[PDB]
Structures are given as structure tokens and as C-alpha cells.
Amino acid sequence: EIFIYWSKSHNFKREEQNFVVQNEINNMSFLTADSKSKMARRGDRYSVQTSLIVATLKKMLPIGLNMCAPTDQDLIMLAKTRYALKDTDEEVREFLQNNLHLQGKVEGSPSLRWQMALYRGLPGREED
Amino acid sequence: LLLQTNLINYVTSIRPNIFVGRAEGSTQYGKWYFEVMVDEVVPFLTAQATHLRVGWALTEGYSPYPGGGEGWGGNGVGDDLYSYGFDGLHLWTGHVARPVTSPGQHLLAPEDVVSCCLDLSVPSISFRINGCPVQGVFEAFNLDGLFFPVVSFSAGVKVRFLLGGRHGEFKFLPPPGYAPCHEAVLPRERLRLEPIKEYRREGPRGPHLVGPSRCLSHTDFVPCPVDTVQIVLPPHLERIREKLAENIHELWALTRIEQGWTYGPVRDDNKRLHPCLVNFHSLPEPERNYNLQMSGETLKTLLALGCHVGMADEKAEDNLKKTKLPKTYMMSNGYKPAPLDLSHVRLTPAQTTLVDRLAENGHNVWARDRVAQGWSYSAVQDIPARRNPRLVPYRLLDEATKRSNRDSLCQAVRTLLGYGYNIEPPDQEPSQVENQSRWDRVRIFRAEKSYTVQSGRWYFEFEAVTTGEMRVGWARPELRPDVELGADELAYVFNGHRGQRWHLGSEPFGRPWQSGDVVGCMIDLTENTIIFTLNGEVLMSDSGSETAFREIEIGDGFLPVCSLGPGQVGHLNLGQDVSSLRFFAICGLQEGFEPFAINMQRPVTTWFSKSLPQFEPVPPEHPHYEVARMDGTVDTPPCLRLAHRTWGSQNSLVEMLFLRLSLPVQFHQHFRCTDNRDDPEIILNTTTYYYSVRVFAGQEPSCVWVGWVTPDYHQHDMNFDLSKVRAVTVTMGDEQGNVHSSLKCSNCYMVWGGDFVSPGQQGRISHTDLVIGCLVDLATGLMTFTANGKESNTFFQVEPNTKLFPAVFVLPTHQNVIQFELGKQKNIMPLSAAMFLSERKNPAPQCPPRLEVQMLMPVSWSRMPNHFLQVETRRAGERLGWAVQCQDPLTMMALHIPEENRC
Amino acid sequence: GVEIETISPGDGRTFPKKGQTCVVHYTGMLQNGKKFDSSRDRNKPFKFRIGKQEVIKGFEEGAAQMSLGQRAKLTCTPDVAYGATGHPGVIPPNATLIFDVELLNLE
């Protein structure tokens, strides 16, 4: 939700680098500090890739995608399409209720079958 | 003409790690004896007869790779000249079975005894069946390399190794002068039975790919120290010639005082009350000044190594004292420390390494001297037989004795350091023990071409059991087998021995692993990215980049590839079973990646770079070597000229090259009992065939070999000479001597071009081309050579049904090197009748397109079988020894190439 | 005519005489070392009536010398073999035949 606000508020983007340039934020120590502890120019001042919001997102993303079942990615890409049509959170929730039965099938693809095995085999996955 | 197919049983070989060999000043005794006990043998478990052979083999080329190969597969002992085998009826050598007379000859039946006698003082390998001698012995065989026991067996056998002493009792009396083979075990290792150099061993979770096994060498049993004679003794050393001797006159005596070995005035050293701590003046004078000049000898070793001394600080003589301890108190002329006492003094690692090699150079001089007095090695000590368990070079010695030697001289160098005199390390020179066989170091493992992927995101694991030079990554389908990964664009690999990434070079990336780590490689053909994950953690380059490689073209595709160095173990987990993956959920599962073999039934066909030389035709696009086919004119016969394209230029390729023709000549099935125009009545009946080679001007004949090779020649030596030619003579006779059948067999039939040149004062670059000719008589098996139209002294005789390939071994030293001439002479038939049946009565020589010149590629690709023979090996007990069992059958259908005689 | 070398001899007492069928489980090979026929591939013993000249002369005269359970290596010259006419499409003219015969049983 923080990244949603960042992605939508243009002034938040605009004064993000203003805070960066005024504080001389390197943005590399916040990611490579453990690399130095592990003994291991172009974007020297500011870049979108060095932002801490997405820097946190790339680490959170496997965790967030872990909860979602393998039958729901097909809903994710069509959700990307309807989100591209600028549908709010309430609207996309209603569209999910409009197409709940359009989710993936276990025998619909051999790629999904092993995904069910390695997803449902976790102790924390409850069938209810 | 047509390739033949047949069902062939899988054959594996099992050896004990008992290695023996001879060399100049060798520390290994050259006479040995062992036995093989046959428990159960199935005569026919499958359609092919059960294979079971016993004999010796050579450590530097006997590589019976499972699957197809020489002849009709199932290669074991005796199928090539790197091994000699006996199976109860034949003395197998050079893939030829020769019957031998025995007292009741038969195949290796259950409840049988096979005794092997090895002599290295003279070349001889004797055999005994059930104690009855075998009337046939190998002689005149190569000594280079090491000889070890080995049994080659198909499925359905139970054999036991009788090694005598503790691992058996030999059930018989070994011949005099022949020692039991169990005495040859090196002290650092324990006796065990392992197969020959392999590429796969089973593991708890899966097959472990195995990098080349490091092999011990005969040259590693000769102790070669640095000579300590031509050293003028320096003034600063004679100045300290005394204290460094006084401190080592009873240092070995200090430990045992005030114990059961406590000295007494009535006796002296070596009388179970040794110490005598008083002084060395009381001790005998010759060993006394001997100990002084042994301290000097250690200082001379320091000089020859590169150690020099310098005095800076306060003299230790002042601030040192002798401590009359309550321990080591004696009644004989007062009490004192047995060596000269010393206070707090330390030693840096340079001194540790230096004292290590100083003890090495002491041990190797002692061993050299003992050998010069005749002594040798035996794991059990025999003083009247003059054998010791410690007559091996220091590098092969045991850690107990290493520490015991190093302790005394560590005290000595410590006492030297106390006086402030510097121990100067010498210069560092990097050296490699083995350099020639650069190919028996990397064994590239990859998948079959049909598994090539050109899309999607893929994942696989590679558990690094060891932490050596092992590379894992992705490679293109046309990856060369004899080139290390990363040298070209055909590899995108991460070398994690020290944390480097390799693609058209090498640059640092990530961190090296440790034992047990799992390297999860990525590939993303959609995003054109390659990532390497170590223990579930994404590796980093020397920047903030998360991807090892980027902007990679799709190309022909990529394959999961890995390679292993010598003595390395790596488990490859391509992903056939998803549960077997360790870090897939941690990295790969949540980011759209999939296992490489996620939906497959059979295991992925994995191809390994087979490091055994084979003969293949020259590529037409070869930048260095080209072969030109010159048409036969009115006066010149057809020729195959070899010219070096890039000779005499920068970055050229200059190395020993082996050349051969693509077609053989087979000798007759039965040998016969007991102007300038060819006469038609006799040229149609002659059995003599002649070919010649033109050594061009500027090409030195000193590095030219000309002759014939049998199709089992796989000897790629860059420093090749006639000594390395494999050969063996098998002599057969009656029960009491009477050698009546002395058969000489060899794979390489070469002559030296340096013996065919007139030794003038100067002008070795002859303006006239050297035309060496070769004549072979198929009806008799006798073959000779002509220097310049005149016959030479050298000749060879071969057995019937033998195949010879026209070969020339040469080191290129000119723009034009050689030229294969398919000519003919007076009443001599050209090769067109000795290679083509349809051209048997065609006198005019021709060069048909099938005949073409071939190189000797060192490494060629091969396929690892989806199943391997299950061998049960264990120690049955003290009385029996080690038992080998194999019952599960495995059969392969092999396509056999007739002319090359290989399947 | 034929040269016999014993391989795994059995009893050496009872020989196949006239009147009873000879059941051999053999393995044939050409002199060059290329196998051309066997019976273990078919997994059925080769039963031939003795004395009726149904088998080649070399094989027929060889089979008498081995005993029950005796395996021997024969060597049949082309004269006692198919000879100049050979075996059409299988054995070339004037070839010497080596047979790894094993007289496993009689009847």
C-alpha cells in the first residue's frame, strides 16, 4: 500500500530525489551492507532502481506470493489487465467475485500439478 | 561396409589399491604375488558368455570406460596393451586371445585358484592355475607406470582377493623371492577395493559425478633431495657450528629421562637405558663429530634451500640459562638438560614450512642411502630381508613419522632463532607436478542435445561435496569437449573454487563455496539473464548487479553443464524429483522458475567429455592444419599433402601431431607355409604392398615417425619417442623351458626418421625431400622399410588377422611438413588392392574419397549409461579377505564400426 | 577335419551315439571374430537328429567327441563346412567356422 501511494502520488516521487540529493543518499550501502559482511557513476546520485520502496518490494515479493495458491496466477494477469483499466480496490474485488470460478484447474496443465504438490505439502496450508 | 549390432553384457573392473612399479633408485621391491579365489561363476547369465579375467594393469592409460569401445565391447583386462589378463585358457593381451597349455586347462570354474607372479627386476609375469604352472609368460613389456591387481568381470560372479598375511593365506607356497602383495600398501591409506578411474559413484540422495582420480606415480617413490656436497661452508655458520650441535646431541634423549629408560653409569647409549645427558665427550668420538657435521649438514641444507642468517638483537648466550630441573636428575657427573637449554623463543610460519622441507630433505637422503644399500619398502618390517615400513618419500610418509622428524629439527631451528639469526625464506617458484595431460584434469558433464532449451526459466542444483576446481553453469549445444568452460563464448559458467565467473575470460563474482553447499543455477531465456544462487542466497558481482550475465542471445539454446577437477565430487540435481531440491522454495519457486527435468520419467541422458584419444578426420575449416588432395599426374602418384597454414607466424600452433589414414589393411586369413615395368604374371599374384611419405624440405626428420598403427592406439604423447611404444612378447613352451612360441604384439609400429639421415657436420635442412617407404607382405606378415630406395635393417612380424593403419607421427617444423604418397614400385602392388576388395586387380594406384587423413582428437564426447553394474565389495573376514559379488545383469546393444574395429 | 578344444568339460563318460537326438546350445562365430549365429539369443536349445546329415558335416563329426555337459570350441574347415557355395547371404565363400558348442543335455 505504501508502494501504491508512491506509484500514484507524483509529488512523492518528485521530492523523493529532492530528499536524496539534499541528504547525499548513496543507496548502495542499504543493500550491499551484508555483501561486505559476506566479504564480496551512472546512477550515482539518484535512480528509480535504487529506491528503498522497490528495494523492500523485491525482498517482500516471494513472501507475499507465497500465500497465493497456484490456481490464482491466471487471475493475477487478468487482474493486471483490469487494473490497467484503472479499477479501484472495491471494483477489482467485485470482478474477482464475478470470475471466482475462472481459476486454474489441477489437471489443466502438468506445470500446475507439481505446484499443487509443493504448495499443499506445506504444514501451514489449510484446506479450510 | 554395414554397421553391425549385437547385444553385449556390461563389464566392470575392480582393483585393490596396491600399486607397484620400478624406476632408477626405486623404493619399491619388484617381485610380488597374489591370488584370486573363485567362489561361484554363472556360465551363461545372459546370451553372451560371462566375462571373467585376472591379471595386472598399468596406471597410465588403462581406462576401461563402461559401455562401448575397442573390439566388440566389454573391454577389461587384456583388451589393450595397458593390461595383461589370464582367464584360465587364454593369456589376454592386445585384444587377442592366445591359448596356453595347462595341466587340465579349462575356464575359471567355481572352487578355482589363480595365482599371479610379478617380477620387475626382469620383465616377467607368471601365472599359476590351481597351483599348476601356466606354460606362458609375458616379457619385453613397458615398465613406465605402475602395476596393480585388477579383475574384469561381467554379471554373475563371486571372486575373492587373496592377498596373504592378514588378508588371506594364499592357500599355497609363493615362489621364492616373491613377496605377498599386501605388503605394498602405503601407510597413509588403508586397504580397500575400488573400481578403475570412473565418473560416477552412487550416493545417499543421488549419483555423484566424479572428477578424474589423482594417480600416484613411480617417480613419486624415488627420493630426490637437493645435493648437499658442493657447498663451501660459510664463516657465520662455522661460528655457530657448535651450539646447534650441542643442542642436538641428546635432544632425542631428553624425553625419556626419569622413566624406565633412565641412564646408568655402567652402560651407554642403545642399551635400553640410553640418555647419557652428561656430554658428548663421554660419548664416542666418531658419532660425536658426526653429530657436529650433521648439524653442519642441516645448515648446508638451509643454504641449498635458500636460507641465510643475519644478527641484529641481544646475544641469546647472555639471557639464556641451563635449568637443573628436578626431573632429568642423574648421578653420573651431575645433572643438566640433555640438549642445551633454551628460554622463550617463537617461530613464524615461514620457519614452519622451511623446517617441514628440511625434514623432507633429511628423510629423502636417508631413504636414498638405504636404497643404495639395497633396502626397500614393506608394510611389515623385515630386518634380515632388509625391508622397512618407512622407506617411502616424505610426501608419502605417515603423519606420525612426519611429526616425529619435524619435532627435532623444529627444536633445532628454534634454537637457531633464539640467537637472533634470521631464517630467510627463498624465492617462490610455482610448479606443477603433471603438465602434459591437461585433458585428464577436467571432465565436462552436460546433458544430451535433445534436452536443449530455448525458452522459459529453468532451475537446477549442484551440491559441491568437495571445494576444488569445479565449474557449474550453462553451455551451448556445440560445446567443445577438450576446451575448458569460459575460454570461448560457448559457456556461461561460475567457477566457485575462488569466486569467479567465466564467459570469454574470467572476472570475480560472488564468494567461493564450502563442502556441502548447493549451487542453484538460474537461466531466463525470456529476460536473457543468468543468475547463480549459493545456499539459497543470490550471488553478487563486483557491483550491485544481481545477475551474473545479461543480454544473452537465444542462439541454439543452452544446456545444464558442469565440470570437475581432479579428485572432486559433485552431485547434480537436474530436478527429476522436486522434493530432492533443497533451495527451490527459498529461491526459484516464487519467481516463476521451474526445475529443468520437472516433468520427465527417465533420468536425463547426461553426456561426459570422454578423455581418451580417438582418430577423427580433419575439419575443413581448421586454421592451423590443412590437407590437400593432389591428383595423380603422369609421373607423380596421388598424394595427401599436409601443410601448416599458420607456421612461422604469431600465435601459431606447434605441438606433437599424430596423423593416420582413415582406412586399414588386414593381413591374410592364413599365412603361407614355410624399362622398370611390372610383369603381369607376377604383379597379379604379389602380396607385398608399399606406400611412401615425402618429408618436405625444411621439416626435420629428427621428429618424424613413420609406419603403421593398430586400431587400438590411443596414446597421445606430446613428447613421444620409440620408448613409449606399447609392446609385449608372450613366450610359450612345454612344462620344462623349451620356449617354442615367442609372439611379439604391439599397437604402434613406428620407425624414427632421424635414423634415416646421413649425419653430416652441418646442413640438417636437406634440399632434397626424404621419401621413406613402407612395405608389408600380407601373405607372410613380415614388413620392412626403405630409406631412399634401399631397404633398411628394421623389420616387423605380425600375427594373422591383424589390422594396420597407415600412420605418421610428426612435429610440424615447416610450411610443408609431409605428403602421403600412394605410389607403387617394381613388382609391388599399391594399397588400392589392400584396402578395397573391388580394386584387388587394379594395378593403377588411386585415391578414392573414402580414404582421408585423420588427426588424434584427445577428448571426445560420450554417453553415460542410464544404469551401471551393481558391485558388492566387502571384507569377508580375516581368513578369506576381500569378496567381490555381482549378480544383476545389464546388456547393451552396440553398433560396431568394422573398419575401425570399435563398437 | 575339425579341431576341438575343451572349454568347460563335464563328465567325459557318456557320448552321443547313433539313435538319440543331440541337443546342443551352441554359439557360432566367423573366423574374423564377428558372431553370426547363436542359440542363447533365441533362448531355445538346438535339437538335431544325429546321422541324418541335416546339419553340416563339420558340426556332425564334431558333436560326437564331446560328452554330456561338455562345452568345447570347434574349428571347421570350409571342406567340412559350407565351402565354395557358402551359405547364401550369411557366410561368405570359403570360410572357416568356429563354434562354441555346449552339449547341455541329450533328449
Side-chain angles (χ1 to χ4, degrees), chain A, chain B residues 1-267 269-320 323-326 328-334 337-903, chain C:
Chain A
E1 295 177 357
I2 297 169
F3 170 68
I4 291 177
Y5 290 152
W6 181 37
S7 177
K8 295 178 178 305
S9 174
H10 65 279
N11 302 325
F12 199 60
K13 300 188 195 57
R14 279 279 302 112
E15 269 72 9
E16 181 186 4
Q17 69 266 13
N18 288 150
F19 187 80
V20 170
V21 296
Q22 271 70 243
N23 298 262
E24 283 72 30
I25 304 295
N26 52 32
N27 282 318
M28 212 48 68
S29 59
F30 303 150
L31 309 181
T32 59
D34 274 349
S35 181
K36 324 175 165 79
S37 299
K38 289 293 186 58
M39 201 155 198
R41 306 302 303 182
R42 186 62 176 82
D44 198 356
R45 193 40 65 212
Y46 169 78
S47 61
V48 181
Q49 65 183 359
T50 56
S51 174
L52 266 292
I53 299 187
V54 292
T56 314
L57 292 175
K58 69 180 187 292
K59 306 291 108 176
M60 300 324 89
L61 194 61
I63 324 296
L65 290 174
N66 203 277
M67 185 180 288
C68 295
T71 72
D72 308 330
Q73 280 90 20
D74 52 351
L75 306 185
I76 307 307
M77 290 57 79
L78 64 90
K80 292 171 176 288
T81 61
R82 69 173 190 260
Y83 262 101
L85 276 296
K86 299 287 97 175
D87 297 340
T88 187
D89 299 1
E90 196 276 337
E91 179 51 78
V92 296
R93 283 191 209 100
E94 305 315 315
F95 272 137
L96 293 174
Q97 294 304 115
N98 301 151
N99 304 266
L100 266 182
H101 48 274
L102 274 300
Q103 52 200 351
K105 186 201 162 32
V106 57
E107 288 96 11
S109 179
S111 52
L112 305 189
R113 318 182 311 149
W114 66 264
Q115 287 184 355
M116 311 325 178
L118 210 55
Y119 184 87
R120 300 279 160 230
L122 304 183
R125 296 301 167 175
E126 185 37 66
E127 298 81 0
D128 297 332
Chain B
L1 286 172
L2 265 46
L3 311 160
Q4 316 298 323
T5 66
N6 205 7
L7 276 183
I8 297 159
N9 287 336
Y10 271 108
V11 162
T12 184
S13 304
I14 284 299
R15 74 173 179 180
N17 51 0
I18 283 151
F19 293 163
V20 297
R22 212 194 60 182
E24 282 295 30
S26 183
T27 52
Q28 270 173 331
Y29 190 69
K31 268 169 160 208
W32 301 93
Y33 180 87
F34 69 95
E35 284 201 354
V36 164
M37 172 65 177
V38 173
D39 282 348
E40 312 180 56
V41 159
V42 177
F44 290 99
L45 189 57
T46 302
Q48 195 182 6
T50 294
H51 185 190
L52 189 77
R53 292 187 205 151
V54 188
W56 295 83
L58 196 146
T59 56
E60 312 274 40
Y62 173 72
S63 187
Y65 286 126
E70 270 299 307
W72 268 103
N75 287 142
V77 189
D79 294 282
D80 54 356
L81 291 172
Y82 284 122
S83 60
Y84 318 96
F86 175 67
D87 57 351
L89 285 157
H90 298 310
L91 268 191
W92 284 90
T93 176
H95 208 87
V96 175
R98 46 212 77 201
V100 294
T101 298
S102 305
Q105 53 190 359
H106 51 64
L107 270 185
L108 294 194
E111 292 305 20
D112 273 334
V113 172
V114 194
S115 304
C116 302
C117 305
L118 180 61
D119 189 356
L120 294 173
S121 61
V122 300
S124 69
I125 301 169
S126 304
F127 271 99
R128 301 211 317 195
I129 186 66
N130 279 311
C132 301
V134 180
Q135 280 66 60
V137 168
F138 306 95
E139 295 93 3
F141 61 95
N142 302 100
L143 180 73
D144 51 302
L146 289 80
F147 295 86
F148 57 100
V150 57
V151 58
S152 69
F153 55 95
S154 64
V157 295
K158 300 200 179 147
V159 299
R160 290 210 328 279
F161 270 106
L162 297 174
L163 296 167
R166 183 195 37 256
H167 313 268
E169 62 272 20
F170 283 157
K171 291 193 176 306
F172 285 117
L173 172 44
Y178 285 74
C181 280
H182 71 268
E183 279 177 344
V185 290
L186 191 151
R188 195 190 281 96
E189 50 86 17
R190 320 180 63 258
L191 184 60
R192 51 140 173 73
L193 260 58
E194 201 56 2
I196 312 299
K197 324 189 169 50
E198 51 178 343
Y199 42 76
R200 175 252 189 208
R201 313 174 297 99
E202 56 89 20
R205 292 160 49 244
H208 281 289
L209 315 177
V210 173
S213 60
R214 305 183 181 93
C215 173
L216 225 283
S217 166
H218 53 276
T219 69
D220 290 356
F221 287 86
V222 292
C224 49
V226 298
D227 54 290
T228 65
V229 181
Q230 287 72 42
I231 294 90
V232 291
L233 191 153
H236 44 76
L237 292 202
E238 61 203 17
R239 188 271 328 161
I240 198 54
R241 187 168 170 80
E242 189 61 28
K243 193 256 180 177
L244 273 294
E246 288 179 347
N247 216 308
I248 63 167
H249 271 97
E250 290 92 6
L251 189 152
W252 65 83
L254 188 62
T255 78
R256 60 185 178 272
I257 316 166
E258 276 302 89
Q259 268 89 46
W261 291 31
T262 298
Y263 179 67
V266 297
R267 290 312 305 127
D269 308 320
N270 296 320
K271 299 289 94 176
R272 301 287 85 73
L273 59 85
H274 301 199
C276 186
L277 60 83
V278 184
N279 206 275
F280 39 84
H281 307 122
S282 163
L283 297 188
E285 288 66 66
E287 61 89 27
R288 182 264 188 188
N289 67 11
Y290 191 64
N291 189 298
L292 279 72
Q293 75 88 1
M294 280 314 78
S295 167
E297 178 74 20
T298 61
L299 300 172
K300 285 160 78 64
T301 304
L302 296 191
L303 291 173
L305 261 53
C307 191
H308 313 274
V309 305
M311 192 305 288
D313 206 291
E314 62 180 0
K315 301 295 187 292
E317 307 153 308
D318 309 282
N319 197 359
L320 182 156
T323 78
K324 195 265 181 184
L325 294 191
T328 74
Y329 157 71
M330 294 299 291
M331 61 285 288
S332 85
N333 194 358
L340 201 153
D341 202 300
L342 177 60
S343 55
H344 59 278
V345 168
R346 283 81 186 178
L347 309 91
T348 67
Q351 284 72 354
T352 74
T353 80
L354 185 143
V355 69
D356 181 275
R357 43 171 189 299
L358 177 64
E360 189 192 276
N361 184 82
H363 190 53
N364 287 9
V365 167
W366 171 85
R368 171 174 70 181
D369 293 3
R370 280 303 151 74
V371 162
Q373 292 108 28
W375 288 48
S376 298
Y377 175 53
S378 66
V380 291
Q381 193 194 110
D382 306 319
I383 293 305
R386 299 182 297 87
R387 307 182 71 196
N388 210 17
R390 287 182 310 276
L391 280 163
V392 297
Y394 203 60
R395 260 177 50 258
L396 300 176
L397 212 54
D398 51 320
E399 277 73 359
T401 315
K402 288 185 199 289
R403 184 175 297 111
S404 79
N405 290 109
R406 283 180 298 212
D407 275 322
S408 165
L409 301 202
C410 198
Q411 299 301 109
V413 65
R414 198 191 62 178
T415 51
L416 194 43
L417 278 173
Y419 279 34
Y421 287 83
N422 293 29
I423 296 304
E424 289 294 338
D427 282 351
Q428 278 63 231
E429 296 91 331
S431 293
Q432 192 78 40
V433 179
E434 154 193 4
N435 290 78
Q436 174 178 310
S437 191
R438 58 204 314 167
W439 297 282
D440 297 306
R441 293 300 186 90
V442 45
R443 186 170 303 176
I444 313 174
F445 288 61
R446 66 156 168 80
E448 202 178 39
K449 289 191 180 179
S450 67
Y451 299 100
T452 306
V453 287
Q454 287 175 146
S455 295
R457 300 161 295 193
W458 302 112
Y459 160 87
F460 73 99
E461 289 182 353
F462 172 74
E463 167 172 343
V465 180
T466 60
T467 319
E469 174 73 25
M470 301 186 328
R471 307 180 179 181
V472 55
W474 301 83
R476 296 203 169 278
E478 68 275 16
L479 177 75
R480 291 270 315 183
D482 52 2
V483 176
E484 288 91 9
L485 303 101
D488 47 33
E489 69 275 16
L490 297 174
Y492 291 81
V493 66
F494 155 71
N495 196 329
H497 175 207
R498 314 160 314 295
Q500 291 83 18
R501 67 178 188 191
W502 282 72
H503 167 242
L504 282 166
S506 177
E507 61 267 17
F509 172 88
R511 64 176 181 277
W513 59 82
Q514 69 261 12
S515 176
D517 285 356
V518 172
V519 185
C521 304
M522 282 305 78
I523 203 169
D524 196 329
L525 277 297
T526 61
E527 269 76 17
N528 301 320
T529 52
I530 289 180
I531 297 99
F532 292 95
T533 77
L534 177 51
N535 299 332
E537 307 294 332
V538 179
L539 289 185
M540 293 324 197
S541 63
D542 51 10
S543 55
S545 186
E546 271 158 352
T547 63
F549 306 96
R550 66 182 65 255
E551 311 295 30
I552 53 170
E553 69 275 16
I554 304 312
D556 304 69
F558 300 97
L559 291 156
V561 71
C562 68
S563 67
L564 280 76
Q568 298 304 317
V569 173
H571 177 205
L572 180 60
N573 202 336
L574 288 177
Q576 185 181 359
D577 188 9
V578 56
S579 65
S580 63
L581 302 173
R582 293 286 179 263
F583 295 95
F584 174 57
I586 286 178
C587 185
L589 170 57
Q590 319 298 335
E591 50 188 1
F593 285 76
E594 298 190 347
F596 185 74
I598 176 64
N599 290 101
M600 292 180 183
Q601 322 305 97
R602 305 165 301 278
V604 175
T605 295
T606 51
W607 279 49
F608 86 110
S609 66
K610 183 261 288 181
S611 63
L612 187 62
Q614 299 280 353
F615 287 107
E616 279 84 5
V618 295
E621 56 92 32
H622 204 280
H624 318 276
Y625 307 127
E626 67 92 14
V627 177
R629 175 144 323 160
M630 281 143 89
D631 190 295
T633 68
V634 292
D635 51 4
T636 55
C639 293
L640 295 166
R641 177 173 53 85
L642 166 73
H644 205 296
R645 313 158 58 63
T646 182
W647 169 255
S649 312
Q650 59 276 71
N651 290 318
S652 65
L653 187 62
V654 182
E655 84 282 22
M656 200 43 225
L657 199 58
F658 303 92
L659 280 298
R660 93 158 194 183
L661 284 193
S662 55
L663 293 175
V665 289
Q666 188 170 2
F667 285 85
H668 282 176
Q669 190 69 238
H670 62 316
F671 284 166
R672 302 300 149 251
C673 56
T674 300
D675 210 3
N676 196 358
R677 314 155 32 87
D678 288 1
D679 296 330
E681 60 97 10
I682 192 64
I683 198 55
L684 266 292
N685 199 13
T686 187
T687 60
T688 306
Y689 303 92
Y690 165 85
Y691 87 102
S692 48
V693 60
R694 175 177 305 276
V695 184
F696 282 111
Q699 174 65 35
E700 283 154 9
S702 301
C703 302
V704 180
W705 291 258
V706 177
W708 309 78
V709 294
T710 73
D712 72 328
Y713 180 85
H714 307 283
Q715 193 168 357
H716 180 67
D717 195 11
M718 282 73 74
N719 81 0
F720 165 75
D721 53 352
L722 286 185
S723 70
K724 307 299 184 53
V725 170
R726 298 293 99 175
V728 60
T729 294
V730 190
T731 50
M732 294 179 184
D734 66 356
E735 188 67 28
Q736 54 272 14
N738 292 318
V739 170
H740 68 263
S741 182
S742 179
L743 298 175
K744 182 179 183 292
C745 307
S746 179
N747 55 3
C748 182
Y749 289 82
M750 272 316 108
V751 301
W752 183 29
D755 296 328
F756 282 29
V757 297
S758 165
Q761 316 290 332
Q762 201 58 44
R764 186 61 63 193
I765 302 99
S766 179
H767 63 279
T768 305
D769 315 328
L770 175 56
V771 185
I772 305 176
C774 313
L775 287 91
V776 294
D777 193 9
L778 298 192
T780 58
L782 61 91
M783 67 193 214
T784 52
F785 306 88
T786 62
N788 293 292
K790 63 92 176 179
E791 53 90 17
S792 182
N793 299 324
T794 182
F795 76 103
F796 293 96
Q797 180 62 42
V798 293
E799 305 185 33
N801 289 301
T802 312
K803 290 188 178 182
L804 290 190
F805 275 88
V808 161
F809 296 165
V810 63
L811 165 54
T813 53
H814 202 246
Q815 289 283 116
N816 306 332
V817 182
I818 62 170
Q819 184 196 47
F820 278 88
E821 298 175 339
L822 310 168
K824 70 178 304 306
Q825 291 292 279
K826 175 53 211 163
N827 199 7
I828 314 176
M829 187 66 204
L831 279 174
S832 64
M835 310 144 67
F836 317 107
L837 195 146
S838 60
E839 297 322 285
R840 183 65 60 84
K841 310 311 171 184
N842 197 337
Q846 295 184 32
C847 187
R850 187 179 178 183
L851 182 63
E852 200 268 326
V853 177
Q854 296 179 340
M855 293 177 70
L856 189 63
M857 311 325 188
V859 183
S860 299
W861 282 114
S862 171
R863 181 185 182 276
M864 293 182 286
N866 303 118
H867 303 288
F868 298 88
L869 273 173
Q870 298 297 330
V871 285
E872 275 80 17
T873 315
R874 48 170 294 275
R875 190 170 184 174
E878 299 295 325
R879 305 149 320 140
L880 299 185
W882 299 88
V884 171
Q885 180 178 348
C886 181
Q887 305 306 132
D888 209 23
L890 265 184
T891 313
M892 65 179 288
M893 64 179 288
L895 185 152
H896 170 254
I897 306 187
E899 66 273 16
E900 292 186 5
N901 193 21
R902 48 176 281 259
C903 70
Chain C
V2 298
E3 315 190 63
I4 53 163
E5 284 95 307
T6 182
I7 306 176
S8 70
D11 55 352
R13 295 179 66 251
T14 65
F15 300 72
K17 61 188 179 296
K18 275 85 172 174
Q20 75 268 27
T21 64
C22 187
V23 187
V24 297
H25 205 66
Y26 75 102
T27 308
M29 291 145 188
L30 276 166
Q31 206 177 7
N32 46 47
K34 296 183 276 282
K35 176 162 81 66
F36 84 107
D37 175 278
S38 175
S39 297
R40 297 172 179 84
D41 52 354
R42 273 85 67 87
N43 274 97
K44 184 160 51 53
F46 173 52
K47 297 181 175 70
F48 72 102
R49 194 51 200 171
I50 192 161
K52 311 304 174 264
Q53 278 68 239
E54 56 202 34
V55 288
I56 200 56
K57 180 67 174 66
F59 207 83
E60 212 285 338
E61 66 183 1
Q65 291 109 344
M66 60 223 67
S67 71
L68 271 299
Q70 200 269 13
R71 159 197 200 159
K73 194 181 87 74
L74 282 71
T75 302
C76 295
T77 191
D79 194 317
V80 303
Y82 291 93
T85 196
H87 208 287
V90 176
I91 283 167
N94 301 316
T96 301
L97 277 298
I98 296 89
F99 296 104
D100 187 356
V101 180
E102 169 175 37
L103 174 48
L104 73 164
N105 189 359
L106 281 192
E107 278 48 48

